[PDB]
Amino acid sequence: NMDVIGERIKRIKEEHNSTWHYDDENPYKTWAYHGSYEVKATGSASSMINGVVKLLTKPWDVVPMVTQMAMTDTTPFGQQRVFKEKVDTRTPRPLPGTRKVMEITAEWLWRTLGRNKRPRLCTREEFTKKVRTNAADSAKAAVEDEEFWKLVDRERELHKLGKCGSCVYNMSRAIWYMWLGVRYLEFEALGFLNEDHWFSRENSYSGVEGEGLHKLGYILRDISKIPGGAMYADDTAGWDTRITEDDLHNEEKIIQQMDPEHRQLANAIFKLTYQNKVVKVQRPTPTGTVMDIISRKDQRGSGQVGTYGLNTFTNMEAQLVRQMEGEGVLTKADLENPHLLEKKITQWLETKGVERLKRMAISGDDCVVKPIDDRFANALLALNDMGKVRKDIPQWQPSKGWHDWQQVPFCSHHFHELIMKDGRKLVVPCRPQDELIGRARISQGAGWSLRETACLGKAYAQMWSLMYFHRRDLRLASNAICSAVPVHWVPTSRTTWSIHAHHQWMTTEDMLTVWNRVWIEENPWMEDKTPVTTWENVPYLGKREDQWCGSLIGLTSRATWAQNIPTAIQQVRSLIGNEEFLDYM
Ligand SMILES: COc1ccc(CC(=O)O)cc1-c1ccccc1
Ligand SMILES: [Zn+2]
Ligand SMILES: [Zn+2]
Numbered sequence: 001n002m003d004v005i006g007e008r009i010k011r012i013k014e015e016h017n018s019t020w021h022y023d024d025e026n027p028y029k030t031w032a033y034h035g036s037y038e039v040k041a042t043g044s045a046s047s048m049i050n051g052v053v054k055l056l057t058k059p060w061d062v063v064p065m066v067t068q069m070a071m072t073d074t075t076p077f078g079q080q081r082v083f084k085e086k087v088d089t090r091t092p093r094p095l096p097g098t099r100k101v102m103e104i105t106a107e108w109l110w111r112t113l114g115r116n117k118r119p120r121l122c123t124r125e126e127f128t129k130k131v132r133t134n135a136a137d138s139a140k141a142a143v144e145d146e147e148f149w150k151l152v153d154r155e156r157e158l159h160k161l162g163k164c165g166s167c168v169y170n171m172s173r174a175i176w177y178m179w180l181g182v183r184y185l186e187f188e189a190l191g192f193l194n195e196d197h198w199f200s201r202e203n204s205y206s207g208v209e210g211e212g213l214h215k216l217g218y219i220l221r222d223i224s225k226i227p228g229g230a231m232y233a234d235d236t237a238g239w240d241t242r243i244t245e246d247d248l249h250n251e252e253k254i255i256q257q258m259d260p261e262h263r264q265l266a267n268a269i270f271k272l273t274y275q276n277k278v279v280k281v282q283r284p285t286p287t288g289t290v291m292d293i294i295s296r297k298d299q300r301g302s303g304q305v306g307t308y309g310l311n312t313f314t315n316m317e318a319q320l321v322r323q324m325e326g327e328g329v330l331t332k333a334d335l336e337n338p339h340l341l342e343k344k345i346t347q348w349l350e351t352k353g354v355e356r357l358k359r360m361a362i363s364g365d366d367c368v369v370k371p372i373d374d375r376f377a378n379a380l381l382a383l384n385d386m387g388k389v390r391k392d393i394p395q396w397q398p399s400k401g402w403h404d405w406q407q408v409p410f411c412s413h414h415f416h417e418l419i420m421k422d423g424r425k426l427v428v429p430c431r432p433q434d435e436l437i438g439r440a441r442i443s444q445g446a447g448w449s450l451r452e453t454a455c456l457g458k459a460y461a462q463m464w465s466l467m468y469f470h471r472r473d474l475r476l477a478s479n480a481i482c483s484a485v486p487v488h489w490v491p492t493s494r495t496t497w498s499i500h501a502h503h504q505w506m507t508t509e510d511m512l513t514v515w516n517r518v519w520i521e522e523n524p525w526m527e528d529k530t531p532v533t534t535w536e537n538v539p540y541l542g543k544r545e546d547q548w549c550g551s552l553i554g555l556t557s558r559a560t561w562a563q564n565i566p567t568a569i570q571q572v573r574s575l576i577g578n579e580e581f582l583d584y585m
Contacts, residue, residue: 001032001276001295001297004164004271004272004276005164005276005277005278005295007158007163007164007165008164008165008166008167008168008278009034009035009278009293009295011165011166012037012168012278012280012293013035015175016037018037019036019037019038020035020036020037021035021036021037022034022035022036023035023036023285023290023292026283026292027080027083027084027088027283028088028292028294029088030088030089030090030296031087031088031279031294031295031296032294032295032296033292033293033294034293034294034295035292035293036283036290036291036292036293037290037291038287038288038289038290038291039282039289039290039291040289041075041076041282041289042074042075042076042282043073043074043075043076043078043079043282044073044074044075045071045073045075045078046070046071046072047069047070047071047072047442047443048442048443048444048445048446048448049070049441049442049443050440050441050442050443050453050456050457050460051450051453052450052453052454052456052457052481052484052485052572053440053441053457053460053477053481054441055568055571055572056457056477056480056481056484056565056568056569056572057437057440057441057477058561058568059552059555059557059558059561060434060437060438060441060552062557063434063437063438064434065432065434065435065438066434066437066438066441068438069435069438069439069441069442070438070441070442075282075284076282076283076284076289077284079171079281079282079283080281080282080283080284083171083281086237086238086241087238087241087299089241091241091242091244091298091387092387093244093245093246094244094246094385094386094387095335095336095385096336096337096338096340097330097333097334097335097336097337097338097340098321098335098382098385098386099246100338100340100342100345101321101324101330101334101335101340101345101382102246102247102250102317102321102386103250104342104345104346104349105317105320105321105345105349106250106251106253106313106317107253108346108349108350108353109313109316109317109320110253110254110256110257110313112353112354112357113198113203113204113313114254114257116203117196117198117203118257119192119254119257119258119259119262119266120192120196120259120262121188121189121192121261121262121265122187122188122189122191122192122195123188124149124152124184126187126191126195127143127184127187127188127191128143131143138176139180142173142176142177142180143180147177148177148180148181151166151177151178151181152181152184152185155167155181155182155185156185156188156265159185159264159265159268159269159272160264160265160268162268162271162272163272164268164272164273166178166181166182167181167182167185167186167272167273167278168182168278168279168280169182169273169277169278169279169280169301169303169304170279170280170303171279171280171281171282182273183304183305185265185269186269186273186304186305186306187305188265189262189265189266189268189269190266190269190305190306190309191305193254193306193309193310194209194305194308194309197209197210198309199308199309199312199313201219204312204316204357204362205354205357205358205360206316206319206357206358206360206361206362207312207316207362207363208361208362208363208500209308209309209312209363209499211500212500212501212502213411213413213429213467213498213500213501213502214428214429214466214467214518214519214523216361216410216411216413216415216429216500217413217415217416217417217427217428217429218427218525219361220361220368220405220408220410220415221405221415221417221427223358223359223360223361223368223370223405224370224405226358226359226370227372228359228370228371228372228373229370229371229372229373229374229375229376229377229401230370230374230377230401230402230403231368231369231370231401231402231403231405231408232367232368232369232370232371232376232377232399232401232402233366233367233368233369233401233402233408233409233410234367234390234399235365235390235391235392236365236388236389236390236391237389237390237391237392238391239300239311239315239364239365239388240299240300240301240302240307240311240365241299241300242299242387242388242389243298243299243300243311243314244298244386244387245275245297245298247298247314247386247387248270248274248275248298249275250314250317251270251274251310251313251314252267252270252275254266255267255270269306273301273304274301274304274306275297275298276295276297277295277296277297277301278293278294278295279293279294279295279296279301280292280293281294307364308363308364308499311364311365312362312363312364315362315364315365315366315367316357316360316362318383318386318388319360319362319367319369320349320353320356320357321382321383321386322369322376322379322382322383323356323359323369323371323372323376323379324345324348324382325376325379325381325382325383326371326372326373326375326376326378326379327348327371327372327375328375329344329345329348330345330381330382332381335381335382335385359371359372361410363410363411363499363500366410366411368408368410374401376399376401377398377399377400377401378398378399380395380396380398380399384396411498411500412431412435413429413430413431414430414431415427415428415429415430416428416430416470416541416545418470418539418540418541419539420532420537420539421537421539422530422537424526424528424530426470426519426526426539427525428467428468428470428541429467429468430468430470430471430541430549431549432549432550433471433473433474433549433550433551433552434550436464436468436471436474437473437474437477439460439495439496440457440460440461440464440495443456444456444493450575450576451489451576452492452493454484454485454486454489454572454576455485455489455490455491455492455493456491456492456493456495457481457484457485458481458482458485458489458491459491459492459493459494459495459505459506460481460495461477461478461479461480461481461482461485462478462482462491462505462506462507462511462514463495463496463505464477464478465478465482465505465511465514465515466504466505466511466514466515466518469515469535469538469540470539470540470541470546471540471541471546471549471551472540472543472546472551472553473551473552473553473558475535475540476562476565479584479585480565480568480569480584480585482511482582482584483569483581483582483583483584483585484568484569484572484573484576484581485572485576485581486576486579486580486581487508487580487581487582488508488580489508489579490506490507490508491505491506491507491508494506504517504518512532512534512535512538515532515538516531516532519532520532565585566585569585
C-alpha cells in the first residue's frame with residue numbers, strides 16, 4: 001500500500017521531522033497508523049451563545065435540548081471519542097452474489113444517469129466564483145494568489161503520472177494551500193456531479209438535488225400517490241463507515257463515460273484519494289497534543305466534494321437491490337452464488353428500474369422508498385450483506401414503514417399539509433421546535449461584535465419566516481428578532497450548511513415578498529398564483545400539531561414571554577444603539 005501513500009507521508013514526515021515519532025500506544029485498530037507530530041489544540045468543548053437570539057427566547061433557557069446543542073466538543077479529546085465509536089471498524093465483505101447484483105445495478109444506474117448529460121471537468125474559475133459567492137474566508141485569499149494555482153498544477157502533473165504528493169484529508173499557508181488544492185483537484189475531476197445536477201429529480205428520478213427543503217414535502221406527497229406498500233425511511237448506522245471497497249469500485253464506473261483527459265484525472269482522484277487515503281487526526285497525550293497520520297482503503301471521507309453525490313448513487317443502487325429482494329427477484333441462494341444469473345437482474349432493471357427509482361426520494365444516506373408491496377419490510381438479506389445495517393434495530397427485525405407521508409422522516413424533517421384561509425394547500429417542512437431554537441441560539445466562533453451576532457440572529461429569524469412560519473413560537477420570536485435588529489443590517493453568515501438550503505432569507509427584502517415568491521409564484525405545486533397580502537393570511541399548523549411538534553403555546557411562561565416581548569426587544573435595541581428599527585409585533 002506504501003507505493004500509493006508513501007509520498008504524502010514522506011512529505012509530512014519531512015515537514016515535521018522536528019517532532020515526528022511513532023507513538024507505540026496509538027489507538028488505531030482498523031486504520032494503518034504511520035506516525036505523529038506535535039500540534040496546538042484546535043476546537044472547543046462548548047459553543048458561543050448568540051445573546052440576541054437568547055435574550056428574545058427566554059422560555060427556552062429552561063429546555064434540555066436547547067442546553068445540549070450549546071455544547072458539542074471539537075477538541076482533540078472530542079475528535080478521539082467520535083473516532084473510536086464508529087470510524088475504527090471493519091465492514092464484512094459482501095457475498096459473491098451480492099457483489100454481482102451491485103455491479104449489474106451500478107452499471108445500469110450510471111448509464112441511466114448519463115443518458116442526457118456527459119461528464120466534464122470543472123474549472124479554476126468555477127471554484128473561484130464558488131469560494132467568492134460564499135465568503136464575500138482565507139480560501140478567498142488563496143484563490144486570489146497565483147502561487148496556489150501553481151502548486152495545484154504541480155499536484156495535477158503527479159496525478160497524471162498516477163502519483164499523489166499532497167492530497168491529505170483532515171478529520172501556516174503551505175499546509176492550508178495543500179488542503180484547498182486537494183479539494184480543487186477533487187472538484188476539477190468530480191464536481192460535474194453537483195455542478196451539472198446529476199442527482200436532480202429530473203435526471204436521477206430518486207434524487208432531490210437542487211430541489212430545496214420547501215419542495216421535499218411536496219415530493220414525499222407525490223410518492224404517496226404511487227400505488228404500493230407503506231413508505232419506508234430506514235436510517236443506516238454511520239453510512240460513511242459502511243462504504244465498502246466494492247462500493248468504491250462500483251462508483252468508479254462513471255470514469256467510463258468521460259473524455260480521456262477527464263478520465264485520467266478522475267481515475268487519479270478515485271485510486272489515490274478515495275480507494276487509498278491519508279488522514280490527519282488530532283489526539284491528546286500526557287505531554288500535550290499530537291496529529292496522527294493514518295490510512296485505509298475503504299469508507300468515505302465525509303469532508304469531500306464527491307461525498308454527497310456518490311452516497312446518493314450507492315444508496316439509489318442499494319435501495320433498488322432491496323426492492324428486487326422484496327419482489328422475489330433476489331433470493332438468499334442468489335446472494336451466496338458466485339455464478340448468479342445476470343438475465344433476471346438486467347430484465348428487472350430494463351423493464352422496472354426507472355418506475356422503481358420514481359418510488360424513492362434519496363439524499364445521500366437519507367432515503368424514502370415506497371415499494372410495490374410490504375415484502376420490502378422483511379427484505380433485509382441484501383441490505384445487511386451490502387453493509388448498510390440499519391441503526392438501533394436488531395439486524396433481522398422487519399422495518400416499520402408509514403402509511404401517512406406526513407409521518408415520514410427525511411433530511412432531519414417531517415412535512416405537514418396545511419390548508420390556507422382561501423382553501424389552497426401548502427406542504428411545509430417541520431422538526432421538533434427545540435432543535436430549531438437550540439440551533440439559532442448558537443453563534444459560530446468568537447470575537448464577534450454585537451452587529452455580527454445580531455445579523456446571524458436576523459438570518460435565523462428570516463429562515464423561520466420562510467420555512468417555519470407555521471410554528472407560532474417561531475413566527476413570534478422571528479418578529480421579535482427582526483424588530484430588535486436594524487432594518488438595513490444585512491443578515492451575515494449561514495444558518496445551515498445543508499445542500500437543501502437556498503438561503504432566500506439572506507436579504508433585506510420584505511420577508512412577505514420573499515414568502516410569496518417561494519410559496520406561491522415559484523412553487524410548481526401551487527396552481528393558483530394569487531398573492532398573500534398579509535402575514536394574517538400565512539397559515540399556522542393546527543394548535544394540536546404545533547404542540548405535538550414542541551410548541552410552548554398554552555404554557556404560562558410562554559404567555560408571559562409573549563406579553564413582555566416588547567421589553568426584551570427594547571433592551572436589545574438600546575444595546576445596539578440609535579439605528580433605524582421597525583416594529584413587526
Ligand atoms: C433539509 O434541510 C435542512 C437539514 C438540516 C438542517 C440543520 C442544519 O444543517 O443546521 C437545516 C436544513 C434547512 C433548513 C432551512 C432551509 C433549508 C434547509
Ligand atoms: Zn494528490
Ligand atoms: Zn411538525
